[PDB]
Design a protein around this motif. Structure first.
Motif, short mmCIF file in Angstrom:
data_model
loop_
_atom_site.label_atom_id
_atom_site.label_comp_id
_atom_site.label_asym_id
_atom_site.label_seq_id
_atom_site.Cartn_x
_atom_site.Cartn_y
_atom_site.Cartn_z
N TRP A 2 -1.45 10.32 0.64
CA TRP A 2 -1.46 9.32 1.89
C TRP A 2 -2.46 9.84 2.92
O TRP A 2 -3.08 9.02 3.36
CB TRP A 2 0.03 9.23 2.12
CG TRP A 2 0.17 7.89 3.31
CD1 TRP A 2 0.76 8.16 4.73
CD2 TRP A 2 0.55 6.53 3.25
NE1 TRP A 2 0.99 7.23 5.34
CE2 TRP A 2 0.91 6.27 4.47
CE3 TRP A 2 0.03 5.76 2.02
CZ2 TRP A 2 0.69 4.64 4.73
CZ3 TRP A 2 0.17 4.39 2.09
CH2 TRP A 2 0.44 3.81 3.61
N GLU A 3 -2.30 11.11 3.31
CA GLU A 3 -3.01 11.76 4.54
C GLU A 3 -4.29 11.72 4.00
O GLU A 3 -5.32 11.48 4.85
CB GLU A 3 -2.55 13.04 4.83
CG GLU A 3 -1.25 12.77 5.78
CD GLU A 3 -1.16 11.79 6.79
OE1 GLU A 3 -2.40 11.86 7.48
OE2 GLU A 3 -0.45 10.99 6.81
N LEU A 48 -12.65 9.22 1.78
CA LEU A 48 -13.49 8.31 1.84
C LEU A 48 -14.54 8.22 2.87
O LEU A 48 -15.48 7.81 2.55
CB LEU A 48 -12.63 6.77 1.94
CG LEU A 48 -11.56 6.47 0.74
CD1 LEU A 48 -10.59 5.44 1.00
CD2 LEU A 48 -12.64 5.97 -0.33
N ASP A 49 -14.04 8.51 4.03
CA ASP A 49 -15.17 9.19 4.95
C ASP A 49 -16.43 9.94 4.36
O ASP A 49 -17.75 9.76 4.55
CB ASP A 49 -14.58 9.77 6.42
CG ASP A 49 -13.72 8.69 6.95
OD1 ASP A 49 -13.92 7.42 6.62
OD2 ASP A 49 -12.99 9.03 8.08
N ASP A 77 -19.29 6.20 -2.24
CA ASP A 77 -18.45 5.25 -2.21
C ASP A 77 -18.32 4.23 -3.24
O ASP A 77 -17.31 4.09 -3.93
CB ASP A 77 -18.03 4.56 -0.81
CG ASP A 77 -19.18 3.69 -0.11
OD1 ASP A 77 -20.31 4.45 0.05
OD2 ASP A 77 -19.01 2.60 -0.06
N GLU A 117 -6.68 10.33 1.75
CA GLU A 117 -7.55 9.14 1.41
C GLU A 117 -8.53 8.99 2.31
O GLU A 117 -9.56 8.94 2.06
CB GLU A 117 -6.78 7.81 1.16
CG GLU A 117 -7.44 6.77 1.08
CD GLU A 117 -6.74 5.35 0.73
OE1 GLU A 117 -7.17 4.36 0.80
OE2 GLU A 117 -5.50 5.33 0.59
N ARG A 118 -7.98 8.63 3.43
CA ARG A 118 -9.27 8.50 4.74
C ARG A 118 -10.46 9.61 4.93
O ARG A 118 -11.49 8.94 4.76
CB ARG A 118 -8.39 8.01 5.78
CG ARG A 118 -9.25 8.09 7.15
CD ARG A 118 -10.36 6.97 7.00
NE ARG A 118 -10.07 5.72 6.26
CZ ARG A 118 -11.11 5.14 5.27
NH1 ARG A 118 -12.19 5.40 5.01
NH2 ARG A 118 -10.45 3.79 4.88
N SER A 128 -2.46 4.70 -3.84
CA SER A 128 -3.41 5.87 -3.64
C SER A 128 -2.55 6.84 -4.81
O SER A 128 -1.40 7.02 -4.87
CB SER A 128 -3.53 6.31 -2.52
OG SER A 128 -4.24 5.39 -1.88
N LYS A 160 0.70 -1.17 0.00
CA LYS A 160 0.12 0.14 -0.13
C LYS A 160 0.69 1.28 0.16
O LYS A 160 1.63 1.37 0.86
CB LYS A 160 -0.88 -0.02 0.99
CG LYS A 160 -1.80 1.18 1.00
CD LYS A 160 -3.04 1.19 1.91
CE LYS A 160 -3.99 2.34 1.76
NZ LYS A 160 -4.74 2.16 0.37
#
Ligand SMILES: [Ca+2]
Ligand SMILES: [Ca+2]
Ligand SMILES: [Ca+2]
Ligand SMILES: [Ca+2]
Length: 575
Positions: A158-159, A165-166, A174, A161-162, A72, A18
């Motif tokens: 990297w930071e 997605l949330d 999604d 993405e989350r 990503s 990843k």
DNA sequence: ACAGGACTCG
DNA sequence: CACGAGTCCTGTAG
């Protein structure tokens, strides 16, 4: 101040399963363009690799193509295509920040990592323009500047993405990213890379013919003006028409098309000028402009599809734009003769939805009268004429059908008496009488138009069938023109946007089927509500059954989706 | 380099 | 040129 390893060889800790990956192509047109640097961020750290090193390394190439190694990225289609041109496969892209930002807010106009990062208030990355410059100045900076910028972009990916997605998940978008826009991006990357073959001698001969006609029409225009002037200049032209020739001023001066058609009866010169401009357009854009962009080696054009630009979820196409090749008028339509299959004994196959927008409207509004018309496969424009003018089928005149058709277009665009009046050259009061007759015959469509405007006001946005979103903050404007414009957007966006979701889904389904059938057929172009493929002559009969069926079955609506299809030796003949 | 006004398309 | 796009030319600008 951001720490990384400026690696000089590829190591195993760079091949985690990843990572955020940056594969930077600085040229705006990425087809056959250099890759200038590579950054990787993962659980082990941050890395920058020079591309002659990393791309010559077989383990790194294998990691790139390994679908179980998740990446990503931002604008993975750009990296993918530039890598295709070096013969390298990119797989395993599980998150694309460009497409995530686009679904969250298409109005942001997100075009780089820094613009996407802004939406979550991450600011530790510079805009690409700041690093690279603008136009003439657009230049790759020195290694230490380049490397730090790429590593910061990867760290931002990297930071980010989350939380992206949330938010996509709270919006119920999604699956839209994961099952529709990301898979579509790989398909568009194959299409762009395959390109479309152009018959350049045929284009050069059409160009020669046009230069001759243009000459005769130019000469005629000068004779009729008793003067030489620049016809392509709306300023010089308006002087000739409204001053020297004394033509009426109906709307400095405007020489638009609408205006010149109303003027045509007063003077021979007007129709000649309209014919000039039309031919001058074929000449400059579709002959000269097209030839500027065909590759001189393969004689192909390789469009770039912008998947994250339109406010409704449609694609756009640039450089060249292959979604606006002429078709309406016979002389421009012949341009399509220059678009040919890329192999001997292959043919062009084109399939297209018939009235997908009105069909989507029938479904969304659940209007009984509209849904029945489509269930009967009636000519929807004739039927609208019968209902709004209260006559039987055989009493519908061509003028009546022409006017009912304009109402139907009006309806999908978000109608107003002013817009229909301008379109039909009637009065506002006349146009309002048609709209009122329309809503009496389709009360479900009326109910829908009312509800979607009030829902745009309470929610702040409107959604398409597959949960695409457009925010409409002007829907509460105290200004009438601004508010009206948002209200039309509220009425149109779910229709235009749902039709875009359906065709995108058909593309995904189609590509899976072609591969499952191991056909050589493949997509070349999408034009909003149509798909254009090339395939061996021997695959045609299978295509006639497979393509329509996939397109018709993409989604299940309350009315059927209808698809017509055609094929032939050139784009022109697939009609 | 950039905007306005013309043309192309769904 | 209603809703959604894109390209080329002119003329004004820096
Ligand atoms: Ca190695
Ligand atoms: Ca079409
Ligand atoms: Ca059905
Ligand atoms: Ca068409």
């Amino acid at each position: 101040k951001m720490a990384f390893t400026l690696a000089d060889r590829v190591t195993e800790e760079m091949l985690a399963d990843k990572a955020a990956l940056v594969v930077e192509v600085v040229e705006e047109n990425y087809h056959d363009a250099p890759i200038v640097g590579i950054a990787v961020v993962n659980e082990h750290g941050r890395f920058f690799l020079r591309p002659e090193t990393a791309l010559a390394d077989p383990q790194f190439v294998a990691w790139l193509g390994d679908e179980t190694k998740k990446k990503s990225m931002f604008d993975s289609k750009r990296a993918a295509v530039a890598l295709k041109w070096k013969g390298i496969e990119l797989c395993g892209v599980s998150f694309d920040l460009l497409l995530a930002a686009y679904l969250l807010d298409p109005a942001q106009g997100v075009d780089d990592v820094a613009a996407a990062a802004k939406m979550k208030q991450y600011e530790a990355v510079r805009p690409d323009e700041a690093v690279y410059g603008k136009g003439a100045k657009r230049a790759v900076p020195d290694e230490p500047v380049l490397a730090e910028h790429l590593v910061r972009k990867a760290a931002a990916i990297w930071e980010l993405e989350r939380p992206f997605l949330d938010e996509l998940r709270r919006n119920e978008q999604d699956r839209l990213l994961v099952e529709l826009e990301q898979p579509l991006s790989s398909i568009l990357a194959e299409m762009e890379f395959a390109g479309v073959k152009v018959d350049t001698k045929r284009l050069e001969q059409m160009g020669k013919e046009l230069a001759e006609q243009l000459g005769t029409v130019e000469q005629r225009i000068y004779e009729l003006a008793g003067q030489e002037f620049n016809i392509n200049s709306p300023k010089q032209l308006g002087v000739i028409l409204f001053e020297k020739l004394q033509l009426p001023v109906l709307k400095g001066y405007s020489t638009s098309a609408d205006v010149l058609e109303k003027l045509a009866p007063y003077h021979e010169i007007v129709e000649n000028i309209l014919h000039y401009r039309q031919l001058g357009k074929l000449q400059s854009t579709y002959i000269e402009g097209l030839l500027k962009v065909v590759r001189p080696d393969t004689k192909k054009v390789h469009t770039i599809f912008n998947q994250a630009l339109t406010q409704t979820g449609r694609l756009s196409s640039t450089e060249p734009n292959l979604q606006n090749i002429p078709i309406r008028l016979e002389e421009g339509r012949k341009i399509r003769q220059a678009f040919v299959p890329s192999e001997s004994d292959w043919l062009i196959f084109a399939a297209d939805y018939s009235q997908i927008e009105l069909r989507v409207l029938a479904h969304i509004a659940e209007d009984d009268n509209l849904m029945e018309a489509f269930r009967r496969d009636l000519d929807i424009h004739t039927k609208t004429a019968m209902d709004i003018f209260q006559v039987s089928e055989d009493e519908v005149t061509p003028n009546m059908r022409r006017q009912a058709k304009a109402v139907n277009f009006g309806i999908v665009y978000g109608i107003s008496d002013y817009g229909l009046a301008q379109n039909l050259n009637i009065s506002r009061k006349e146009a309002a009488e048609f709209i009122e007759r329309y809503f009496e015959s389709f009360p479900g469509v009326k109910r829908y138009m009312e509800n979607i405007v009030q829902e745009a006001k309470q929610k702040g946005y409107v959604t398409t069938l597959l949960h695409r979103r457009r925010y409409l903050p002007d829907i509460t404007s105290r200004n009438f023109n601004v508010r009206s414009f948002a209200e039309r957007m509220a009425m149109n966006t779910p229709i235009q946007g749902s039709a875009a979701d359906i065709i995108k889904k058909a593309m995904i389904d189609l590509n899976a089927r072609l591969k499952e059938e191991r056909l050589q057929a493949h997509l070349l172009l999408q034009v909003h509500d149509e798909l254009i493929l090339e395939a061996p002559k021997e695959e045609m009969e299978r295509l006639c059954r497979l393509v329509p069926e996939v397109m018709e079955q993409a989604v299940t609506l309350r009315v059927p989706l209808k698809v017509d299809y055609h094929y032939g030796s050139t784009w022109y003949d697939a009609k």
